[PDB]
Automatic annotation (TrEMBL):
Protein name: Photorhabdus luminescens subsp. laumondii TTO1 complete genome segment 8/17
UniProt binding sites for FAD: I11, G12, E31, R32, H46, R97, F118, D304, A317, N318
GO molecular function per UniProt: FAD binding; monooxygenase activity
Transmembrane residue ranges: none
PANTHER family: FAD-BINDING DOMAIN-CONTAINING PROTEIN (PTHR47178:SF5), MONOOXYGENASE, FAD-BINDING (PTHR47178)
InterPro entries: FAD-bd (IPR002938), FAD/NAD-bd_sf (IPR036188)
Organism (species): Photorhabdus laumondii subsp. laumondii (strain DSM 15139 / CIP 105565 / TT01) (Photorhabdus luminescens subsp. laumondii)
Family annotation (Pfam families): FAD_binding_3, NAD_binding_8
Highest taxon, organism lineage: Bacteria
Entry keyword Oxidoreductase: yes
SUPFAM superfamilies (UniProt xref): FAD/NAD(P)-binding domain
Keyword Cell membrane: no
Length: 376
């Protein structure tokens, strides 16, 4: 009878809705986008053990089998080189974001309410929460979950004092299709599925890995053509890049990274030169301070809404999935008669803060290490 309203049909929100349905809980998702996107995401997601367990425990079996079918293994043995190809030091599931979303959306056609942009909520005096949308509509629910991403309006209303800070580190991310030709022109360590890190003398870094991703981002999702892409990530101090790097053309971003790699091994140049000019992304890294407890209520948050101020390279998808499994389990304990609602929400929030804080800390140190090189 408790009706859970979720803002956002992203990774976390869809996983959550599957989980709640499994436990017999009434659930609706309100999503700002239309059911058919115009552009596909150009990137891949690597699923770790937390993400994998969340998917297997929440998804209907037919969705889980589709996930197993679409994913591929991506490797361990991460290698470290200097910038002159000298080796310094030496199992996840890889899937495209577009496939993962199609799999997550399957079975939710009559759960997801499309074109519903959350604007605010109000507590109703009888208990319950009134949700207002940008088109002027409203709905009433018993529990509100903000799964609405890094700039979550739900979080901004519920926990207004949580503020992001600039890390002082920025990155430029590109992809290159592993075509027959490119495969011939790159050494095997670029294509074998083990990630590589290039550690130069300069205060910056180049990370190399692989994504499964669509060749053409301008087709319907069900028609996406999925291939292997090398992904590269150039990491440096924000102050070492142009003030307006985020407004640079793809061509200027490419030029800039090549300028930073003068003298580095030619294979690294070949990779960057052969990258896709429609999918090069500059990003300024932002983080948040340690999450302190807050008083629990029938409004809560999951995913990037509470974990990641930057939608970035990292483990955001996995953490969003982890949250969804956890919140499913806690809301199920209320449905099944074992715990009070707000107490169960509190338990979720306390556990989530513990791993959230740990992960944020790890991410921050990793970013700093790209510039300082204290780990060598
Ligand atoms: C290039 C790239 C590579 C990545 N690779 C990885 C990886 O390998 N592994 C990993 O674990 N993570 C990875 N991530 C991170 C991962 O994609 C995100 O952390 C993850 O999407 C977060 O899930 P979420 O459900 O919290 O938010 P999202 O998946 O962003 O979903 C938020 C949803 O809320 C909707 N929404 C927003 N505002 C409103 C509103 N006002 N009203 C209604 N709906 C709203 C959005 O439209 C969206 O559907 C990567 C990210 C990027 C950008």
């Amino acid at each position: 009878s408790m009706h859970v309203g979720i803002i956002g049909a992203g990774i976390g929100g869809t996983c959550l809705a599957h989980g709640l349905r499994k436990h017999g809980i009434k659930v609706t998702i309100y999503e700002r986008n239309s059911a058919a996107s115009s552009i596909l995401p150009g990137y891949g997601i690597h699923i770790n053990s937390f993400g994998k367990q969340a998917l297997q425990e929440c998804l209907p079996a037919e969705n889980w089998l589709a996930f197993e079918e679409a994913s591929r293994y991506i490797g361990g043995q991460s290698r470290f080189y200097n910038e002159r190809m000298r080796l310094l030091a030496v199992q996840r599931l890889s899937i495209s974001r577009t496939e993962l979303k199609e799999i997550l959306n399957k079975g939710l056609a009559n759960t997801i309410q499309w074109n519903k942009t959350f604007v605010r909520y109000e507590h109703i005096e009888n208990g319950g929460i009134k949700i207002f949308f940008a088109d002027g509509s409203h709905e009433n629910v018993d529990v509100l979950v903000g799964a609405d991403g890094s700039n979550s309006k739900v979080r901004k209303q519920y926990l207004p004092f949580i503020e992001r800070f600039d890390v002082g580190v920025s990155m430029i991310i590109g992809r290159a299709r592993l075509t027959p030709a490119l495969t011939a022109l790159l050494p095997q360590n670029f294509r074998d599925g083990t990630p590589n890190s290039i550690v130069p003398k300069s205060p910056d870094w180049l990370f190399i890995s692989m994504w499964r991703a669509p060749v053409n981002i301008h087709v319907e999702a069900s028609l996406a053509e999925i291939d292997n892409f090398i992904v590269w990530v150039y990491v440096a101090a924000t102050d070492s890049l142009p003030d307006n790097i985020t407004d640079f053309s793809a061509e200027a971003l490419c030029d800039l990274v090549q300028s930073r790699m003068i003298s580095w091994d030619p294979s690294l140049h070949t990779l960057v030169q052969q990258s896709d000019m429609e999918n090069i992304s500059p990003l300024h890294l932002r983080s948040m301070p340690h999450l302190l407890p807050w008083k629990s209520s029938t409004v809560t948050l999951l995913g990037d809404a509470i974990h990641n101020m930057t939608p970035m390279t990292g483990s955001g998808a996995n953490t969003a999935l982890r949250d969804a499994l956890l919140l499913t389990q806690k809301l199920a304990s209320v449905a099944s008669g074992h715990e009070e609602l707000v107490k169960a929400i509190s338990d979720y929030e306390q556990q989530m803060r513990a791993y959230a804080n740990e992960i944020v800390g790890i991410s921050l140190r990793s970013a700093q290490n790209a510039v300082i090189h204290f780990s060598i």
